Design a protein around this ligand. Sequence first.
Ligand SMILES: OC[C@H]1O[C@@H](O[C@H]2[C@H](O)[C@@H](O)[C@@H](O)O[C@@H]2CO)[C@H](O)[C@@H](O)[C@H]1O
Ligand SMILES: OC[C@H]1O[C@@H](O[C@H]2[C@H](O)[C@@H](O)[C@@H](O)O[C@@H]2CO)[C@H](O)[C@@H](O)[C@H]1O
Ligand SMILES: OC[C@H]1O[C@@H](O[C@H]2[C@H](O)[C@@H](O)[C@H](O)O[C@@H]2CO)[C@H](O)[C@@H](O)[C@H]1O
Ligand SMILES: OC[C@H]1O[C@@H](O[C@H]2[C@H](O)[C@@H](O)[C@H](O)O[C@@H]2CO)[C@H](O)[C@@H](O)[C@H]1O
Ligand SMILES: [Ca+2]
Ligand SMILES: [Ca+2]
Ligand SMILES: [Ca+2]
Ligand SMILES: [Ca+2]
Ligand SMILES: [Mn+2]
Ligand SMILES: [Mn+2]
Ligand SMILES: [Mn+2]
Ligand SMILES: [Mn+2]
Lengths: 232, 232, 232, 232
Amino acid sequence: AETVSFNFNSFSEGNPAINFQGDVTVLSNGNIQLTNLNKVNSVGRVLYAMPVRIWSSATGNVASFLTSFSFEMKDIKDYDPADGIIFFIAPEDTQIPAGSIGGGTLGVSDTKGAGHFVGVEFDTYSNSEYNDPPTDHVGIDVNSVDSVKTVPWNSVSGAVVKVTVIYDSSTKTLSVAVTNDNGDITTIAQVVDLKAKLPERVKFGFSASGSLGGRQIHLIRSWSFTSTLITT
Amino acid sequence: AETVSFNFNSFSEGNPAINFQGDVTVLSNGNIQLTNLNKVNSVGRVLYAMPVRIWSSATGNVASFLTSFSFEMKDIKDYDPADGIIFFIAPEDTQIPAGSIGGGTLGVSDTKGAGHFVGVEFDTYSNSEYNDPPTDHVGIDVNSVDSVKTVPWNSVSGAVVKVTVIYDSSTKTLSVAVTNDNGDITTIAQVVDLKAKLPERVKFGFSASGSLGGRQIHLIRSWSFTSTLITT
Amino acid sequence: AETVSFNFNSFSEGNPAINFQGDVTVLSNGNIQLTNLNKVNSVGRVLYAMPVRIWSSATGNVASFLTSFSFEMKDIKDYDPADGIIFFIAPEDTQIPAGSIGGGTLGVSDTKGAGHFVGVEFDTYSNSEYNDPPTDHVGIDVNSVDSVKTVPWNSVSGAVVKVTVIYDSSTKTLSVAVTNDNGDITTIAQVVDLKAKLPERVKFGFSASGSLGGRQIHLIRSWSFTSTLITT
Amino acid sequence: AETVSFNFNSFSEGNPAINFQGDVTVLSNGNIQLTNLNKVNSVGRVLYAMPVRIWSSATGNVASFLTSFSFEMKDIKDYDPADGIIFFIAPEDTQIPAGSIGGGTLGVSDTKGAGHFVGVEFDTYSNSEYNDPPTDHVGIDVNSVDSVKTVPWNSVSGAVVKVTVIYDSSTKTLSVAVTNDNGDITTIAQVVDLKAKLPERVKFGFSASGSLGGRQIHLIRSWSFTSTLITT
Ligand SMILES: OC[C@H]1O[C@@H](O[C@H]2[C@H](O)[C@@H](O)[C@@H](O)O[C@@H]2CO)[C@H](O)[C@@H](O)[C@H]1O
Ligand SMILES: OC[C@H]1O[C@@H](O[C@H]2[C@H](O)[C@@H](O)[C@@H](O)O[C@@H]2CO)[C@H](O)[C@@H](O)[C@H]1O
Ligand SMILES: OC[C@H]1O[C@@H](O[C@H]2[C@H](O)[C@@H](O)[C@H](O)O[C@@H]2CO)[C@H](O)[C@@H](O)[C@H]1O
Ligand SMILES: OC[C@H]1O[C@@H](O[C@H]2[C@H](O)[C@@H](O)[C@H](O)O[C@@H]2CO)[C@H](O)[C@@H](O)[C@H]1O
Ligand SMILES: [Ca+2]
Ligand SMILES: [Ca+2]
Ligand SMILES: [Ca+2]
Ligand SMILES: [Ca+2]
Ligand SMILES: [Mn+2]
Ligand SMILES: [Mn+2]
Ligand SMILES: [Mn+2]
Ligand SMILES: [Mn+2]
């Protein structure tokens, strides 16, 4: 089996295992801050530097993966707490969309909310233009921030959020378990054929964004990931 | 929302939160040994004492849950490494099948392999009578040890295995992620309607068994659990 | 060349190849539990029964050796996690010091912290009397628990720890590699002249201890060992 | 801490985590054959694709690493064998020397035996031009195949060799433990300041070479690696 695994309990600038895109910044406490509180339409993305092969065109096999991470979003005075964070998977050539307006695109889609990626979003602002639910929510996105499915959620400022995601290649099921600060859990599942939506080689990462009036602190605190591809 | 969460980093007899059935024993190191290496057709089970309401006959809602646990199976001289462990969900009044033959039944089914339970088994012996795959495997069982679906797996003697389970109520999807000692992960998912197969109040636990010729060390090292039922 | 090698994937009471000293006990899972959670100032040591020839008085040569073992230390209610484990090399007639107070002596030294042995300690309590660093640590001990050199370490309760030790005869260098649960490694190396500190024949083993208020589970799960002495 | 760990129990083509240089080939059993038995002066090198940061110019710290791997060298009819394998560390832009003559250079140095790298060699031919000992041997190389230190060794055709390496950063000690097929171990250690001889980012890998008359099968069977850099 072809396994890729890494664990980050903190991040440091210069680690070749991580690729920073946009307004990302590593705080002295080891945490990654995704957006710049002083920039308009700030977008910051952090990707695992090594491309992962999620499926083989030879065997036709798709990898299963288990990843968990924890983030934190804190409000700042006296800006709107937006827009949030998205854990995504994209082709290895993925770059912040040219002319990105940040905001509701979450740094992974164009103005229409379209892009090439699969991800789980933790949305804190309701963008009618992308058909967002009326409240905070977790959503499964497939090439669009107009989520294929969303579930009500509640982003608590300054609260640490723990997420666990399991992708089972046989059923092509992506299940997410989000553990809120209060102890309750929120789940959302969705069948997504990675082999049909993405190329053999992809990159995993987080992305966050803001707008002119929408800004907040987006922190990634830790990240563990493991993918295993059956090579026969 | 009605939430139930508990976490054991170690166990101990005398703790009212855990029910013990059969040949179960708690080692001084805090681990739970399910089978007695000196008994024929040994069967041991452990359950969270407090029953958990997984679905409501009033609202029709079904709970979502996140649970992870770690176990260890080791070979004992010159007996066969069987049968294994099964994490199950059962009616709150569940007992070890009357006149149980242990072995392939895993302590949850009758001789024909039938029973009232839903579980994830970590099967180390191939019982043709229950249509087992030809190798060690992980399987989803719905009222039968004749798994609804299985996936090839490999039980490594003396190694500590970490399991993460997610049940998404909305899609009724139960997905399992098994992290092997070598870092490799194995996943398996199956849609299972808990509301249809189980009562509103159920019990979670672990069960392991052995036969006359088949025996091995079955250890439960840790267990965290959190279920959240929407009450509206 | 004279080579001594053995491998233990589990132990058992009654195996003549192992010397049990003190409060040591073998669990039904094959783990060796060094101290007794109920005894005051408990001390337990395990030694490979066959004395090993680490140097020849004829050739002047010292043996090189490669050994790796795994252990687990867990906290018990409530109740300090001390004192820890030590992998030591001592005269073949070594016994627990008379009147041993356990505690920071790790069961290998007298009250002043002196003894006849060489070892690697995994110290989880800071004994000022022995000039311990303020935190958990791994130290190289030469005839005293007042370490020749220590390195900061962190003992995680219930975590399985893997250790690899290489002793190079030509350079008389002892290097240790500790793989924590999170995947991180901790190393510490130190030049130690075995021939000048220990007799021709020695025994290898582990020791651990507790005090009145300091107690924890000290377990040895596995241990492989190979030593080679050039006789020419 | 900043850790990088990977584990290969077998290799496969197409894995983005592995870089192939020269005459490397992946056998169906997952083993890597470094040289081409039908080419003159064959050179094959496999590298971990991701560059690793072994020292920070900011903190001045050096990473400690633990790596073990297994290889096999088997004679082929009536050719000399010749030359061998080397485990090396080099600048992230490392390529097979231009106009490499293979043979004694082991695929990492020029004709004079010079190059930019640090490695552990398993040399099976005695090149007087590089001052090789008269017998097979293991040697520590620092920018030259003219080893800083060597130790007598014997390469048994068809034998699976297990190697374990520990690099302690504080002491800058590189310790190697070689386990031969007959159970005997060979060790060799040397102080090497990686910070002084190499840049912050390097790549780890294996290299094997042959000549017109010297050829043999060079196989890398497995390889696990873990390095930790203190970021503070
Ligand atoms: O708490 C762990 C440390 O205990 C020290 O001994 C204590 C003893 O446990 C307590 O009951 C009382 O008598 O005070 C003693 C001295 O502080 C050990 O000396 C030390 O090694 C730890 O085990
Ligand atoms: O016999 C193995 C050694 O060969 C040396 O090269 C030889 C070459 O094989 C032979 O055909 C002729 O050209 O003489 C050369 C010089 O001895 C390599 O240099 C040495 O590394 C071994 O591979
Ligand atoms: O208020 C957060 C919200 O802002 C939207 O963008 C606003 C922008 O902040 C404001 O300065 C401008 O006048 O109008 C824009 C459109 O409403 C973002 O589009 C949205 O994603 C949130 O970030
Ligand atoms: O090999 C373990 C295997 O045993 C089967 O039962 C055996 C039994 O162990 C033996 O004593 C008897 O003579 O034959 C039985 C039939 O094979 C169990 O059925 C199976 O589950 C394993 O436990
Ligand atoms: Ca939005
Ligand atoms: Ca079975
Ligand atoms: Ca101490
Ligand atoms: Ca040579
Ligand atoms: Mn949204
Ligand atoms: Mn089965
Ligand atoms: Mn100490
Ligand atoms: Mn050489």
